Design a protein around this ligand. Structure first.
Ligand SMILES: Cc1cc(C#N)cc(C)c1Oc1nc(NC2CCN(Cc3ccc(C(N)=O)cc3)CC2)ncc1-c1ccncc1
Ligand SMILES: [Mg+2]
Lengths: 556, 414
């Protein structure tokens, strides 16, 4: 016997205050009981479980389940109750790698660590909580009692403890073999290297020799699946990667769940398929939770869906990462608050692609959305490559400099260059910083009655021009905006506007270029038409001439 | 130091479970090198999956330095750590530190690594060195000693720090010494010549009584810290626009100062006049403007620091590298106002400038009141949280919220 090192035990506890499970065993048929006795007998000879006395007060139900072609019985210990009372663990498997961050490996070997899974002992002070009972034939003897010595399948802590134990075992081997890479998920161990295929394998048995120190048998994985490897929904090929083939279903009736599975396909596809759009599709799922509800598609969802099928005609593939090359990201505006990007190192060979949708809000503009897309790509690139890409943006350097030097918020975009790809992001209007000499001055105001929702809006100017318009079903805030709209409509190309509306100032000073409010959108359309606009604010009800005159003209 | 101090969380609270945010390759490499050394020295130890807690970590380069410093964001753990008293009921903040001619700041956090931490509390200091692209499991550690940035570190170490400072405090009774987290604030009134060496006299003390960043000194001059009262223009000719902006400013100031009057100035704005037209002031308006100007010279009344409430700091971007800020606890009762300009190394980076403003305002807040303010930042959350760690140079971190609607108030501190 070659002495083997013990795998270090992880101490486990139940949640504070909680006790172990005490669930009663279900009645079983004589057939199932015989099945469970033979299996548990084998498992005891292997050391996985052990018989216990009657003093253990905990219990978890056990079942026996039949399969399809294999005319066998398999056990099933239902640890749902124990999992609720088990402490939380550090799950080291939240984020999976992204293929676009992986480097090329000439040789890759896949070994199975299933037999090694049972060499991981369970914390001794915790085993008592895993007790289960095999009921006896005809209930005429005491049921046979068992508890686990190893990590049980279906127990909360088994994935975390198994992965951590393997990592600790593998750590010195990887550290002293910088030429290879080792990646484990579930019960597969993937070993890659840029060593030629003969020299590569020698390191593989060197890993077997290292793993046998803890007595872990590791043979090659049964039926070496030849490329591509199907991993986490991807297709990993020697020189390229892609999503597993996506097929958009053909339907005449689209329901809630069909459209929810359709965004997932398109979202998953958008990482490598350029130009995917999902807004007018995602818009049909606003406030419904009946997954059988049928919804008629807009003519814009059909146009968007048909555009997606055209992009999905032929499969697209991405390249792997080369640290010696630069990292570049290019963004395009797609319309309706939708953006798409590509990340590459050499032209026309994308590492990956993606999309960005604008956040929910009443008013917005393109420069803010572009800035948000940049920050999302920056954070994604840090995750995948540990660095920020150089950006190619459809915005002129002069446009950006005007934007950030004048905007009331601090803002920043990392190193970038203009790329002329229409439609370009522009500033559609710019308010003046000082009053315009020789331009007419419009004092605007509006007011509404909250009882009747009747209101008035209008202006008076320094040239004697005046207008008051009566309005129905309106509010104080809408009449204040209507007054500004009227002044813009009736003025020349340059105009000074004086208002007391803090609400209107808050909107206009946010510099929106588009709004969901039709009235705000009309104001924007007027501002685009002007040469110069100076917007001045004054406090209401304060003896400010022109403002006082128009305030009582509109206050009925 | 061999016997630890018992420490607990606050009632009904578990440890922090805060996600680690993405780190660049160069910061990961620096953290790996730092933590490898700290592990050999016994300050931290690897942990297993039975520890579910986490606190974010990153790396910074302090001002005028070339080596990386580990920075743990203990903000959540500090919120959940019990309030400290132990030795005494608390040391009151020295109100004389802010009036000294020179204040030097020293990084003494390395001294904390000499005191062991309660072995029951250690699990709550868990942190993760992430890997690029999640290609390896994150390296998990916990602290065995008092960690830099934890609220409990200066409190537990306070007794030891007093005994080390006592020979120097006895010699110099005019030197104010204040401790905030990992920072030692040493204020004197003598000139800069050998204030540096008297601060160097502090360095050999801790050196012989017990460092990677001890050699540096952050020099301040709080006696020359300028305030920004409310100022009205002085003009010979006032346009309609000028008077309109003045009435708006005075109407805002009337919420702060009693007896502000604008009715005489509003009478000049009688009629529908062009904004650029010059209006001669009447003497009743000239008199009203003079009385308002006098009111605005005296301080605001009923303004006191309440140590039970939070300090709020608001910041406005004024353009051309200029930033204004106000510190208060209740609206319209500012405890401190100020203005910055020419943030070095950031003429074309708004976020870098804002990040330096936040650090300078926090430093001033520590000197004046001994705690940090909660910031209202004129920036979108996603922009700030992407970039602020790239320009951070302090060893503490304040709290912040984000302003999304443009305040009308920026014009009246302009
Ligand atoms: C994340 C991940 C998933 C799987 C799967 N399932 C496998 C591995 C090894 C893996 O981990 C890494 N995988 C890469 N590269 C990938 C593997 C190699 N293929 C190309 C290829 C070549 C030749 C063949 C062939 N001979 O048939 C077949 C395919 C590219 C993707 N590189 C680095 C790591 C890594 C792991 C741990 N620490 C650091 C880095
Ligand atoms: Mg009005």
């Amino acid at each position: 016997m070659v002495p083997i090192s013990p795998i270090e035990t992880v101490p486990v506890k139940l949640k504070p205050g909680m006790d172990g499970p005490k669930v009663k065993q279900w009645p079983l048929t004589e057939e199932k009981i015989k099945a469970l006795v033979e299996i548990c007998t084998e498992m005891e000879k292997e050391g996985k479980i052990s018989k216990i006395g009657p003093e253990n007060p905990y219990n978890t139900p056990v079942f026996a389940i039949k399969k399809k072609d294999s005319t066998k019985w398999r056990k099933l210990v239902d640890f749902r109750e124990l999992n609720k009372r088990t402490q939380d663990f550090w799950e080291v498997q939240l984020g999976i790698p992204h293929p676009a961050g992986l480097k090329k490996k000439k040789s890759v070997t896949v070994l199975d660590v299933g037999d090694a899974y049972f060499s991981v002992p369970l914390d001794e002070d915790f085993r008592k909580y895993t007790a289960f009972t095999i009921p006896s034939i005809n209930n005429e003897t005491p049921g046979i009692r068992y508890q686990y010595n190893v990590l049980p399948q279906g127990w909360k802590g088994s994935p975390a403890i198994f992965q951590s134990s393997m990592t600790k075992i593998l750590e010195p081997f990887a550290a002293q073999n910088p030429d290879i890479v080792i990646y484990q998920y579930m019960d597969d161990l993937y070993v890659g290297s840029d060593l030629e295929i003969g020299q590569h394998r020698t390191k593989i048995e060197e890993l077997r020799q290292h793993l046998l120190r803890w007595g872990l048998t590791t043979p090659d994985k049964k039926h070496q699946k030849e490329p591509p490897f199907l991993w986490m929904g991807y297709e990993l090929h020697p020189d390229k990667w892609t999503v597993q083939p996506i097929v958009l279903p053909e339907k005449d009736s689209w329901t809630v769940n069909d459209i929810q599975k359709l965004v997932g396909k398109l979202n998953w596809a958008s990482q490598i398929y350029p130009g995917i759009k999902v807004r007018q599709l995602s818009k049909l799922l606003r406030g419904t939770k009946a997954l059988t509800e049928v919804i008629p598609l807009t003519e814009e969802a059909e146009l968007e869906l048909a555009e997606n099928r055209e992009i999905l005609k032929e499969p697209v593939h991405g390249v792997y990462y080369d640290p010696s090359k630069d990292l570049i990201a290019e963004i395009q505006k797609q319309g309706q608050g939708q953006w798409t990007y590509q990340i590459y190192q050499e032209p026309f060979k994308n590492l990956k692609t993606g999309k960005y949708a604008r956040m929910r809000g009443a008013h917005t503009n393109d420069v803010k959305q572009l800035t948000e897309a940049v920050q999302k790509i920056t954070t994604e690139s840090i995750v995948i490559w540990g660095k920020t890409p150089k950006f190619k943006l459809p915005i002129q350097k002069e446009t950006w400099e005007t934007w950030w030097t004048e905007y009331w918020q601090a803002t920043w975009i990392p190193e970038w260059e203009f790329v002329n790809t229409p439609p370009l992001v522009k500033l559609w209007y710019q308010l003046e910083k000082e009053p315009i000499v020789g331009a007419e001055t419009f004092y605007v105001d509006g007011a509404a009655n909250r009882e009747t929702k009747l209101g008035k809006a209008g202006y008076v100017t320094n040239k004697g021009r005046q207008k008051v318009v009566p309005l129905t079903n309106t509010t104080n805030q809408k009449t204040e905006l209507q007054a500004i709209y009227l002044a813009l409509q009736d003025s020349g190309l340059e105009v000074n506007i004086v208002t007391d509306s803090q609400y209107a100032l808050g909107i206009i000073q946010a510099q929106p270029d588009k709004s969901e409010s039709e009235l705000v959108n009309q104001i924007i359309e007027q501002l685009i038409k002007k040469e110069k606009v100076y917007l001045a604010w004054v406090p209401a009800h304060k003896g400010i001439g022109g403002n006082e005159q128009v305030d009582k003209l509109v206050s009925a | 130091p061999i016997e630890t101090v018992p420490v607990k969380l606050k009632p009904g609270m578990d440890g922090p479970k805060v996600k680690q945010w993405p780190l660049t390759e160069e910061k990961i490499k620096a953290l790996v090198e730092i933590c490898t050394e700290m592990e050999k020295e016994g300050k931290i130890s690897k942990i297993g999956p039975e520890n579910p807690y986490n606190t974010p970590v990153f790396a910074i380069k302090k001002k005028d330095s070339t080596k990386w410093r580990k920075l743990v964001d203990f903000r959540e753990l500090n919120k959940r750590t019990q309030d400290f008293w132990e030795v005494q009921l608390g040391i009151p903040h020295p109100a004389g530190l802010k009036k000294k001619k020179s204040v030097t700041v020293l990084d003494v956090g390395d001294a904390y690594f000499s005191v062991p931490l309660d072995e029951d509390f250690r699990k709550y200091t868990a942190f993760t060195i992430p890997s690029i692209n999640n290609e390896t499991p994150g390296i998990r550690y916990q602290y065995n000693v008092l960690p830099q940035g934890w609220k409990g570190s200066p409190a537990i170490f306070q007794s030891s720090m007093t005994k080390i400072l006592e020979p120097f405090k006895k010699q110099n009774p005019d030197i104010v010494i204040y401790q905030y987290m990992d920072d030692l604030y040493v204020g004197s009134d003598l000139e800069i010549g050998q204030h540096r060496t008297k601060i160097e006299e502090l360095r050999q003390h801790l050196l012989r009584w017990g460092p990677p960043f001890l050699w540096m000194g952050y020099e301040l001059h709080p006696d020359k810290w300028t305030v920004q009262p409310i100022v009205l223009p002085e003009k010979d000719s006032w346009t309609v626009n000028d008077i309109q902006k003045l009435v708006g400013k005075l109407n805002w100031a009337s919420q702060i100062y009693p007896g502000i009057k604008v009715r005489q100035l509003s009478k000049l704005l009688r009629g529908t006049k062009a904004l650029t037209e010059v209006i001669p002031l009447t003497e009743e308006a000239e008199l009203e403007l003079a009385e308002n100007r006098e009111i605005l010279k005296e301080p605001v009344h009923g303004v006191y620091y309440d140590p039970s409430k939070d300090l709020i700091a608001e910041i406005q971007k004024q353009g051309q590298g200029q930033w204004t800020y106000q510190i208060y606890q209740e609206p319209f009762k500012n405890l401190k106002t100020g203005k910055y300009a020419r943030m070095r190394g950031a003429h074309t980076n708004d976020v870098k400038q804002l990040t330096e403003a936040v650090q300078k305002i926090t430093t001033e807040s520590i000197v004046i009141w001994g705690k940090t303010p909660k910031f209202k930042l004129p920036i979108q959350k996603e922009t700030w949280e992407t970039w602020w760690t790239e320009y951070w140079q302090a060893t503490w971190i304040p709290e912040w919220e984000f302003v999304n609607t443009p305040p009308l108030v920026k014009l009246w501190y302009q």
